Every structure is written in structure tokens, then in C-alpha cells.
From a paper:
However, in Xanthomonas campestris and some other bacteria, these reactions are catalyzed by a single bifunctional N-acetylglutamate synthase/kinase (NAGS/K), which has been proposed to have evolved from the fusion of ancestral NAGK and N-acetyltransferase. We have now succeeded in solving the structures of two NAGS/K enzymes, from Maricaulus maris (mmNAGS/K) and X. campestris (xcNAGS/K) that have substantially higher sequence similarity to vertebrate NAGS. In both crystals and solution, ngNAGS is consistently hexameric, while mmNAGS/K and xcNAGS/K, as determined herein, are tetrameric. Each mmNAGS/K subunit has two domains, the AAK domain (residues 1–290) and the NAT domain (residues 292–441) connected by a hinge residue, Gly291.
Several MAD data sets collected from Se-Met substituted wild-type protein were not of sufficient quality to locate the selenium positions. To increase phasing power, three additional amino acids codons were mutated to methionine (I106M, I294M and L367M). The asymmetric unit was found to consist of four subunits assembled as a tetramer, and unit cell parameters are consistent with four subunits per asymmetric units and 50% solvent content. When the β-sheet cores of the AAK domain of the Se-Met substituted mutant are superimposed, it is immediately apparent that the NAT domain can adopt different orientations relative to the AAK domain. Relative to subunit Y, the NAT domains of subunits B, X, and A are rotated 25.2°, 24.7°, and 16.9° toward the AAK domains, respectively. The closed conformation of subunits B and X may represent the conformation that exists when L-arginine is bound, while the open conformation of subunit Y and probably subunit A may represent the active form without L-arginine bound.
Numbering used by the authors:
A (entry chain Y): 10 to 31, 40 to 141, 157 to 440
B (entry chain X), C (entry chain B): 5 to 439
D (entry chain A): 5 to 440
Write the structure that this text describes.
Amino acid sequence: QTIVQLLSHMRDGKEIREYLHRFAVIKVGGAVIQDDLPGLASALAFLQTVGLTPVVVHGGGPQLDAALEAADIPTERVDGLRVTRDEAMPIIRDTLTQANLALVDAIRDAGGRAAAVPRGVFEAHIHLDLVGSAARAGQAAILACLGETPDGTLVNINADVAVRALVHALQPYKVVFLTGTGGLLDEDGDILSSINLATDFGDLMQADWVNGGMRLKLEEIKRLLDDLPLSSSVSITRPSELARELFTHAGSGTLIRRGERMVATDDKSSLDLGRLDNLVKAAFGRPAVEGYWDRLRVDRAFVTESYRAAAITTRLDGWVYLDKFAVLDDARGEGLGRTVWNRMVDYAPQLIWRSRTNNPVNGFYFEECDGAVRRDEWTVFWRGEMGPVEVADVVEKAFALPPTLEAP
Amino acid sequence: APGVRQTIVQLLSHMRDGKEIREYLHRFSGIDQERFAVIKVGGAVIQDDLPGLASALAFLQTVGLTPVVVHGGGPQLDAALEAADIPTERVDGLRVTRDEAMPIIRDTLTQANLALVDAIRDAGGRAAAVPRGVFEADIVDADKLGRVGEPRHIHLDLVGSAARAGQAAILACLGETPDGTLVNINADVAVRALVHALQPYKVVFLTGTGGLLDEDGDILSSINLATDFGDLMQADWVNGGMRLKLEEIKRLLDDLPLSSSVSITRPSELARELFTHAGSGTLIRRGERMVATDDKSSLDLGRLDNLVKAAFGRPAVEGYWDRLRVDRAFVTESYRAAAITTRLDGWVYLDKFAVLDDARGEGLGRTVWNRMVDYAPQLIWRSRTNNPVNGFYFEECDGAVRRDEWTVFWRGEMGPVEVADVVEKAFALPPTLEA
Amino acid sequence: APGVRQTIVQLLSHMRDGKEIREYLHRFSGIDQERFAVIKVGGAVIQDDLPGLASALAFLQTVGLTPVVVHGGGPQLDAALEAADIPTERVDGLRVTRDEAMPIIRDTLTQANLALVDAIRDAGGRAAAVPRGVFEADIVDADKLGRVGEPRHIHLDLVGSAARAGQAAILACLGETPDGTLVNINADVAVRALVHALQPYKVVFLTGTGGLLDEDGDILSSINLATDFGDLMQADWVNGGMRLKLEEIKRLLDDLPLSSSVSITRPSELARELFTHAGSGTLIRRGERMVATDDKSSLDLGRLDNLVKAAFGRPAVEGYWDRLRVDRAFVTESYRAAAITTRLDGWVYLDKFAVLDDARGEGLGRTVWNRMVDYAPQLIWRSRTNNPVNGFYFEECDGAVRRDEWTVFWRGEMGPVEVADVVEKAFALPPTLEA
Amino acid sequence: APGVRQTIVQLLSHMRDGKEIREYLHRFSGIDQERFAVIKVGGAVIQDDLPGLASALAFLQTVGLTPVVVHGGGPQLDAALEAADIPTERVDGLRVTRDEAMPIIRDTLTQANLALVDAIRDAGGRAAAVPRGVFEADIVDADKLGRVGEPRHIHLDLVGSAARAGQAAILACLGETPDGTLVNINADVAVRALVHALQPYKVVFLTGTGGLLDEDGDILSSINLATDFGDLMQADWVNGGMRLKLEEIKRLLDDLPLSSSVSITRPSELARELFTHAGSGTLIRRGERMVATDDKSSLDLGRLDNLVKAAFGRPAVEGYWDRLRVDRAFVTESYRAAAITTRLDGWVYLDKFAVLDDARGEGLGRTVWNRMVDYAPQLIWRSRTNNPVNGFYFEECDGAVRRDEWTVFWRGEMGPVEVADVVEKAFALPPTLEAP
Ligand SMILES: CC(C)(COP(=O)(O)OP(=O)(O)OC[C@H]1O[C@@H](n2cnc3c(N)ncnc32)[C@H](O)[C@@H]1OP(=O)(O)O)[C@@H](O)C(=O)NCCC(=O)NCCS
């Protein structure tokens, strides 16, 4: 399993290489245990080989409400969320217990290791003993949504509350809701890929199209993400997408983060220049030249709370010019580089910049530019529309700008 | 998976007991999944010898077997329960358990469960925590014994699940009523019920003491219930507690096929008890009746002749059986062990003691030998110096004269000058076997 | 093994540069018996970059592959020698070993050999020391050269005793005359023989200089002998020192099937170089010839159209090949790579560039692309904004403009003013492929 | 290593011989794995029982023990030389191998080398081929003997490389001069050189007849050289071939630490030889000198009292050593084995036989006991009934009478009337050690 020095060659797995060299709570919408046991199983098995310890929470599918509403015991939603009855425990018990063991077997029959924990975790307060027991043997802990009081009586508990408590106690890296409808929908009703809570939670709540169902579905996901490190994330895909949505570039599911406060200012004195200076020296090979910060004339500075990512804009013959874009390695891990770049370009639809031709960020610049002139040491990029005449001239000035860092 | 199996194979086949062990393993393969062995172990063992316990169990499972383990936690919940200021009431049963005690009982038995699972994995084994989900019980006692339960059904689902994954199933004695209510099961009935649902080949009680003791304070090697059980209950020497364990083991064995057995040892001895004929600890079987007679005509001589031929290698000399006189014959019902006496100048003389390896290991050789010496308090016999059985005879003898080829033993406390002449006679006897 | 394969294939089971690695891992399970790879390593690369060398070498193991490694003396044989006596040199190179200079060679090659074998093991791999017993040599006029030998036979017994063991044969250039007399053999003479006997699919040279530089001074990523050799020998900026290595390399590759290749890079990049189409370092192959013509009557339009359809997921629209007015067409003689150029308002215009991945992997796309841009120092062209070749195109462009669907590129000394219009005509040209 | 070392031990713990094997492992758990054993295999064995040889070696290797194996393809080479011809010359004391015979001594040895390496791998073991590089040698008598060498230096680099990786180093007796001249090494001078260099714990000689023989034709189970060597060397029955082996084995052992030992055995019995204190082989130690004396004042009684306290669990009753009247005393230099004889109504009566467990396993209990019974052909003694040394006592007696607390044994030609008498007396004797 020494699969870590083998991938220090490729593309995006270097960020899985700096967490594989440094786990995942899954809520399963029960409407999918009956559905695709084998595929949901293939997912959790794969999840382990890439060093995530699945801790799965499952309820009943419609298969349980229908077994109930056919025994003449309609549970209904109890005008709360769920789980109301007395005559129902035997059925709930056995419908959950069979489903639980079904999964433990499937995961194994898809290569992964597992552990049936039908009972003894949730109270009515978490006992993680059986969980850690499984984690300690590299086992997926499949947990049924069956709970008990202190004295031992069986009570049915709410998956949402069990998930919360479990996420609080474990501090998982990743939280995953597997649903049949894999992703939140935007305004058009398309698949809303990325939510940055603390840089778009305020808009989202006020937003008209955000019905009360998502309105508090998100207020909850926030409570989860708030109770975790910033490195954590809540994915929302579905079984047959899990792989692509956990670290890689595709994931046709939603990816909520907590994100951090963003500084956008035009006042150089409001910025910690030494923190920025360390950010640049750490992000690039070498440090800023002597007097660089002293001489700097800020147009806009975009700097995330933790000073691990920043874009400093200046003015070049009136054209917005990007003077500095610096992201620490383990903050590109949490999307900060992107949050900063995005906010910056929202500000500057027309933008000029340059990069040393052998800089590794160039692919990204090329991806992002609307035009580019290449030369032996330097490439100038732009976005926004403009005339051959204009750009020619501003591109000439950009190439003539004196270096802002020393060394190779 | 590849390194383990393979290297245990071309392993032990170079070890001392390796042959004997492969042979027990290969046979024990009446797998039916979790039909190998139910092992009871008290909490006092999980508390006083956890490394040892775990190792012994880990060994079984790395050698092919899949023990289902059931554990108590007496010392554990005596401590944890006094610490939480809750008194115990041993009313007409073994202890009432009121609502206030449950949380403690649940957590203490769950802790101990996990400890034992974890320890097994640390020993290199594979083990599943199953503190709940197997015993469904009725709560028949509510006012009288609180929350104690009688196992009404055994759900083996989790046991079967673990076994398939090749894990030892570690079960605690917590049950669930039919409505989901948590319940305390006493370890005796819990074991009875599991043993009845699994019908295992082997039941094993792991104790710190490691065996039942005879009248002399020695470990009683084996018990043949078909012959020894009456005697053992109507015996003044057998303490009240051992009487109970005896009647309980009887109860268990009665509800199993004839091929099953109970063993009683300590963890450190578990392997030698399971995989040697020798054993170590007490072995208990339902067993077979045994015939004592003075009449040769009521004996199956071709059946015996086969026993004698297989026990020693070479056969009986021609005319041996139609000429044999016969003072007394003691023959186990299956003809796999027999003692035949004749008379030597007036003395009782053991002319044949023949036991097949498997019967030796079941303890029928012992059984035949004991009923024989009860008959013949004074006894003469001989044996080749090569006979590996000589160690046993020496333990059993009251005297011995060794020679290059033969060794005369005698039993019964007469003196050297009194047997001197019958010893000379026994030496001069003709071989009763060819080769 | 069961904890190695399917996890490395399951990572590649659906990703990026993993459609092509899983492709290389499959080809590479072809004749594992050690016709896989001879890997020559400079004497120096085992002082400077020993841990990186090891880990590179070990990765190949964890992935199935069993390279035969040959190592030199270099900085070792120099220092350790002169610390006693004055060395000399008579033959073209082949140092010289008087006779009493041998004992040092043996122990020093052995040291380095074991040092390498240990370092690989420490890094997680499997290596066998084969400091001797593979090269059988002849003495070359003793009185002038001493104890330096020419390979007469190659014994592969100890090399297959690793191939069978899954370890990586680490070979020292030590030999023995037909009468056991230890002898010194020369590095790449020894490689020549090893390659001749094993006929590797791959022959890799490791150096601190991660490859071969070109006119500008970049790592020249590939050499197609059929079309590049003369060009490179008759070359100016190819210093005589580079010419030794091409002669040698051509030599080795002529003694190999057309599917083989040489690879000269740095240990850190060896994997990129072996398991990706783009590699990382200098790849050399015997290759294959190509046509450069401006007559459209001389091309197989049927063949080009099947390659375009195989290169992109779609075929040219009806009547394209009909009305195509070639300026220049550059076609590799297998037709697995091609560049076709038309004339756009007086500009040279790259109209089609098509390479099957196979040909991409083996440097034929580069060959075709280079002659083309040498013919057209000033080119215009476009590509779909989401085409992976855009990476290559950017590395090769002097300027670009990107809209949502198309991207226009150019080479040459033009600024945005001189090309503004033709770029605009290029964005407006019609598709030449189906949906 | 620590990862596999744990599991292998857990298994072995619950084996009958788990203890001793566990103990070899811990001994060699670190960075001297090649100092476990040098194993010499006779030419025959590779010819006849290759498959068993291989399985033996592969057993040791599977438990974590890396032998350093040396072979000299004897018989199969003899024939190979009868093949190409020119085979005879045995001038001095060794064979003489001329320039003509070399190219094929090589190929034969180098060949068996691979077969053995490959058998071990097949049998589930791990093994490195080391046919050349280790033995450096000065060429002996250029003329009279030819291309033969006396080892001058031992290069252990390759061996350590093998050990370090957990492979058994398989070494052929091919030498080479400092001027790189391949040469033929004598197999026994080869082992001596290697043993000197590695300072192994075990030196094993695998043979097909596996085990040395005594006068009566029985396997000679152990030799304690400090006390046995001289006798063995002057005994009529000890022949010339065997005398030669003892001479050589004594040299090996005089140059190793005290804890080292030589085993001579059959491949099929290797495990039982190293890991039990049984086995069909002969065990040989440098051993321990031993007094036999009638002189109580020449003995360290304090030490004997401590021997007695460890052997049995209690010290002698007050006044025992003061009162003692020694008939004859056999005490081993280290006081870990002792037999003390007294006089019982004139009969020789063994009053003490005390042997610590380690001494027993070294064969010192046998050294003392055998010397003692040589001196007292007629002997009476007693022993508590629950004494585990009783099985051995029975194996040694000519008769025995058993009672509840005690059992009286005797050896010697003795009439019923006699025995009865002295036996009655021995049962009556008072206990010599304070009670349990
Ligand atoms: C900017 C220039 C390169 C031309 O392009 P353009 O017409 O301005 O179009 P743009 O590139 O500005 O707009 C598209 C771009 O922004 C983005 N974009 C537009 N809508 C988007 C959306 N809904 N979601 C995500 N990205 C979007 C794209 O990602 C794209 O660039 P990309 O291909 O690198 O991904 C220009 O420098 C040029 O030379 N034009 C000259 C003007 C003229 O009229 N010339 C005629 C002769 S004088």
C-alpha cells in the first residue's frame, strides 16, 4: 500500500499525496440500499484504498415506510422530521438490521473490509468504541440508525441528528450525503457545483429561488462545516459519482466548504506586509526584491483571512494589471487560490499579467487567458476584449516591467 | 493471506507435534462455517491473562479454525458497579439486575468485549466484536430478578458474517427482548443456547485453573460419561461445585452428536489439549459403554484380532486366539480398546492391552485400564523396552524389573522376593505376536 | 503481490494520464524474463543521487517490472586507485589495468554494487548483487593493456535467478577469462553485449544530465533515427561529445527489433519517461521515414481520412479531401502521423495535425511537427478550446487568442497587429469534421 | 523484521518447541543475522536428498534464521572428472587439481550452487547464490598440488548482503588468489575459515548417515570435549575417519565462544536437532571440566547447596553437608551438574543428582551421570514420585519399587533377596532437603 511516491508525477493527486502522507462520514439515503447495493459498495471499497475510513449511517428506504404502511402502521413525518411509532420497532429493527448486514457483506464482496454495527452507538451522546474498534482494523463501520436510551430501550433516532453527533465527535475530513438526486440545483435548475458558505451564504439565504427546504438544508450543512476544520468539506453526489467528486476535477455533484473571510481593499496600510512577504517567498522560489512592498502602488488587494492566498492588482497605463498572485500549497488544497482569483477577476474583466515561461502555473493562466504573447523568458497574458493596437502597446510595457523577485 | 497459510503448512511438518496437528486440523474440518468450537471464558481470565487468552485464540484462527467465543465479566462488573454505587442482589438465582444497573452492565461487557477483540488482533488474529445482536430473550422475572433474560432465540447472522470473513466471533452476554429492550443473560444458559444452535464439534471452557482435579488433587485427564458419570456423582470426594459443572457438561453433551467433546483448560494449554492425543486439561465425552466378561465365546475374536493387529503393527501368532485361556476381558463397546487377563501360576496377568491411537486420545484406553485394575489389585505384566507405552506403565506400576528385551511390571503392594518367581515365569513366556 | 496490482490499476481505473499508463503497464508485462530493460547507470549517479536512483529502481518492481542494471566505476575507480598508484590510458578509452591494479577494482566495483543493492532494498525494492559471473571475456594483448577483457560469452544464469525471484539484477562490469582469471571489462562494451544477449524492449541510460540538449539548450525530447541521424551527425551545435553517444545508441538499436528504444534521463523522471506518452528526457528509436510533398495526388486520401477519424473521434466532412488545396503535406510512411498545410489569405495555415496515441508515444508526432514548422517559420492555426494538444500548442506558439469554442495560435515574429485579421478569418473558417 | 518476528513467535509460542525457537529468534533479531549458523553439506546429500535438504534450509529461513551454507559437490564432481578424464592424484594429504581439472570443478560447483538455491526457493524458502567472491586464497603448492589455495582472507560482504535481506547465503568452495586467479579450496579448510570469520552460534554438518556412533553402534548423542576428547582419542573403537572429525571439530570449537556448538545430523532431522534437546544427531560442545573426588574439603559446599536449592526447590536441611560422608563426588566445574554418592550398608547409594535445566540441555547431566555410573555399576537411589526426572531414572534403572511418596531405583545384577533388603533401607532414610 506504499502508493504515495508513485504518484508524485501527475496532476491533482499531489493534493491527495499531501493528505495520504498526513475520516469520511457517509449518510446513505436509504432509498438506495435496496437500489444499488453493489455500486454503493464499490464506492466505499475504493474510498478505503485511497486512505479514507468510511463511517456509514443508513436509515430505511421507502422499503421501510412501505413495509410499515402495509402493516397498517403509517409512521408519517410526525410533523417534525421522522421516526414516530411504537408498534413499529420490531419492523424498523429488522428492516434496518437486515439492510446493515446486507451492506457489510456487499462491501466485502467488492473487495473492502467492514464491520456491522447495527446497534450500540447512538443514545437518547455517542459511544464511538465500536467505531474506533473498526477504524483500528481498517474497517468501514456500517452504522444502523437504531438508538437506545440509558436503560437500554430501543428508540428510532433521526439520521440528521445522528449524523451531526457523529461528525462532531469524529471531526471527519469529508462528510458525504449520498442521495438519488445527486446535487443541489441553481437558479436555472442546473447542478450547482461549488458552494463557499462564508463567501456566499449571505446571498443564498436572502435569495428568492432558495425554498425553505434548501434554506435550512444549508443552514444545517453550515453547522456541520462550522464544527470542523477548514480542510473539511461536504460532498453531495450519488453512489456512481463518488470517486470523481472527492478530490478530482469533474464531480457532477455539489461541494460545500466553509470558506474564509476575504479581504478586498485598496488601502496598503490595512495589510500585513510581512505576512504577504512570507506568502510570496513561500509561494514562489525566492523573495520580493528590496523595496518591493515599499514602492507598491495598490489598485486592489484580494487577500483571504489566513494570508495563504492573495492577488494584488496594480494599474498599468490605466489598465488593471495583476502584480502578484500567490497561493500556499496546502491552501490550493482547500480552494483558496481559486476563491481569490475568482473574486479578483469579477473586479477586473479586463486584465493584463505576465509569467516566467517555465512557471508551473502557466497552464492555469493559459486556461484562463483570452490572449497571450510568448517570449523566451516571459509570457504576457490578457483577459477581456481589446484591439490589436491597444494590446500590442500594453503588452510591450508589461514585458518592460523590471523583475519583482530575485534569483532563478 | 498468502504468507500465512502457506508458511504454517511447510512449517509444523518440521515441528515436534506437527504431524499430529495437521491430522487434527484436516479432520476437524467439519466446518459447516461456525461448527468448529464454542469457547466459554470467564471475565476473570480476560482480566488476569488477556495476552495469553488472545494468543491462544489467535492461534486457533491462524491455523484454520473459527472459534465462536462467549465471555462474561464478573470481576469487571463487580468493580465498575460498586464504583457507581449500585448494590447487587443475588436473590434466588445468581443476581437481580435492576434498571439502574443496566448502563453499567452494557458498558462493562462492551469494554471487555472490545478489549478481547483488540488483544486478538494484536496477537495477529482476526476477531469480530459482537456484544449485541445474537441472543433474543424473554424477560421472565420482571419484579423478581429485574432485567435478566432467558434466551428464546439465537440469531446467528453476525456469527456467520464474521466466520465468512474468517474472524473469531466474540460474543458478550447481552440479549434483546422481542421489543428491543436490553437484557442481561447469565453465562450458563447463554452458552447452552449457542451450543444448541451451532451444534459444535468442540466446547471449551478456558479457566485459570485449567482442568478438573481427581481425588488426589491431580488433573483428571479425561471423563467417559457413559461409565464414569454415575460413579462421579455418588462419590463423596467430588466437591459440590465440580458436581454442578459435571451435571452441566452432561446436559450440554447430551444435546450434541456423539462426535462432540468438551475440554477444560487454560489458554496456555489450549493447543496441546486440542491437537495431541496426550491432551492437557480435562476432556469430557458422552463415550461408550464397556463390556466386562469371563466368557471367550461372547467375544468377537476377529474384531479383537483386528484391534490387536492395528495397535501393535504385527499380528497375533497362529493359534493364539483359539488357545487363549481368559480370566477376564474388558472391551470398550466399539472394540477400539481392550484389556485381557489370563493367569500366570495363580497371579492375574495382563496378556493384552490394545488401544488405537484415536481411542487413546478419547481416553478409552484409560477407561479400560482403570476398570481392569479395579478387578486385579494384584497384577503382573510385561512389555518391550521399546514400547512407547512404558511411560504409562511405569506411572501405573508398583514395581519393575528391566531387561534388554522385556520389562516386567507389577501392581499391588507385594515385595520383591514374593513376585521374584512369577517375574521369572513372565520373562520366559513365548512371544504372542509375530515379527 | 495481491497488495500491489489492482490498487495501482484501480487508481488508473478511471483518470487522466492513466488511460495511457494502464496501456504501458500492459505492454510492459510482455516478456518479463528480462527482455524488458537494460539500464546503464553512470559511475557518478550512485554517489550523488543514490537514494533517488534506488527509489526510481524500486518503483519499477512494485509495478511488476524487472530491469537488469549495469553499473560503472567512475569517480570511485579514480579516487580509490590513485590513492595507491598512477593509472594510465592506451586504448581509445578502456583505461588500463596493469595487473596489480586489479584487487582494487574488484573490491571497489563490489562496494558500489552492494551499496546500490542495499540502497534499492532500503528504498523498498528487491535487488540481487551480481558483481561477477555474467561476463566471460578475452584478454586483449596483455603486455600493453594488462587485464582488460572483451566479452566472449554472456551467462544469464544468475540474471534469471533474479528474474525468477522478482529481484533486480545489479551487475558489476567485472568479468573472467575462460580460466577463471578475473578481468576488467569496459562499461558500454558490456552494455552492448548485455543488450545483444537479452534483446531488451527498453534500454535506459541514467545520468545527472537528465537527457540530451538541442540547439537552444532544452532537453531534446526525442530522436527519430530514420529521419534525424544524418541531420544530427552533419550538425553544427552537436559537439563531438554528443556524437559518441548517438553512434553508440544507433549501434545498440540496430541490434534490436524496431519496437525497442533507448531512453536517457534522470532517475527522478524515469517513470514519467516510461509510463507517459510525453515522457521526460530523450527517447531514441530506429524510427521510420516520412514524405514531404506539395502534390496531393501522391497521398493516400483514404489512409489520411482513416487516421483523422482515428485521431479525432470524427471523419472529415463530405467533400473535404476532394477540395483540399494542399500547400505542404508531411506524412510519416506508416500514416500514423501527419501535418497538412493550406494557404489562408497568403498565410501558411496548419489545417490538419493528426497523430495516433501510439505514434504520439514514440515521438513521430514531434518529427512531423518539426519538419512542418521548419518549412513554415510563420504559421497560423486553430484548435478546439478543450483539446488536450493545446498544451503542446502553447509550448510551441509565439502567441494565442482564445474564444469559447476555438483557439487561434501563431508562430513567427508577428505581434497582435500583423495577425489580427487572419486570426479573425481563422475563427470564422468552417468545421472540417463531422459532429 | 519486527513486524513478521512477532507473528512467527505467536504461532511458535503454542508449539511444544516454541520456547527454544522463540529464543534463537530474539538472539538474532538484529544486525548479525549471518552469525546464526554455518551449515556444511556433504556432496552426497545434494545428490541424494536435494529435496529434503532444500526443505530443511527453507524451514530455518521461513522462521527468520539465515544459515550460511557451504557445499563442495563431492561425488557428482568425482564422476564429472572421471568424465573429462585425468582424475586420480591424491599426493600429500589432499587431492591435487591441475590446470586441466579446473574449468569443470567450477561448472560443477557453480551448477549445484544454483540447483540448491533454486530448490530452496521452490521449497518456500529464500536463498542467494554466492558461488564466488568470498574465499580469497594464496595458491598452496604451485607444483606438487597445483591450482589449490589456502584461504587468506574472507570477504563477508556478499554474505551480509544476503543475510541483511533475509536470504540464506549459499556458498560454493571456489577460491580466488589476490591476482584474481580462480582456485580450488579444500572444503574443510573452507569451513574452518568461514567459521573463524563469522564466529557463528551453530556449526552444522548435514550428512546422510546423520549422527556419530558409540561403541555399541548407538547414536552418540552429545560430546562434552573438556571431559570426553582425550578418552575418545585413545579408544580402540573410535576409528581413523571419526578421529579425524573430532580433531577438526575441536579446532572449530576452540576458536568460538563457549555458547557455540557443533551439530552433526541428517537434513530431515535439523529442526529436532537445533530446537529440541532430543534429536538423532550428535551435539558437540567445548564443554566444562569435571572433578571426581573422595575429598569433601576440596568441594565448594556453599555452591553445591545453591545447586541443590535451584535444582529441587529447597535447600538441604540444617547440618546436611557437615554430616555428609562422601563416597565419591562428580562435580562439574561450573557447579550446574553434580552427582554425590554415599554408602548405604556398603552399597553405593546416589544421594544427590542435581542438574540445572540449562546444563541438562547442554548434555552435562549426561556427562556427570555417565561418569558416575561408570564408577558405580551397582547403584541404589531414590527419588520423589512427582519428580520429572523420573522418566529418565526409569530409562536408566534395572528395577524400581514405587510407593506413594518415594520410588527406589537400582542398577546392577541383583538377586531378589538383596534388593529387597537395601530397598527397605532406602525407603527408611530421612529426607535430606527441608520440606516443600
Ligand atoms: C479578447 C480577444 C482575444 C478576442 O476574444 P473576444 O472576442 O474578446 O472574446 P472573449 O475571449 O473576451 O470571451 C470569451 C472568454 O471568456 C470566457 N467566458 C465568456 N462567457 C463565459 C461563461 N458563460 N462561463 C465561463 N466562461 C465564460 C471564456 O472562458 C473565454 O476564454 P477562453 O477560451 O480562454 O476559455 C482580443 O484580444 C482580440 O484580438 N480581438 C480583436 C477585436 C476585433 O474586433 N478584431 C478584428 C480586426 S481589427
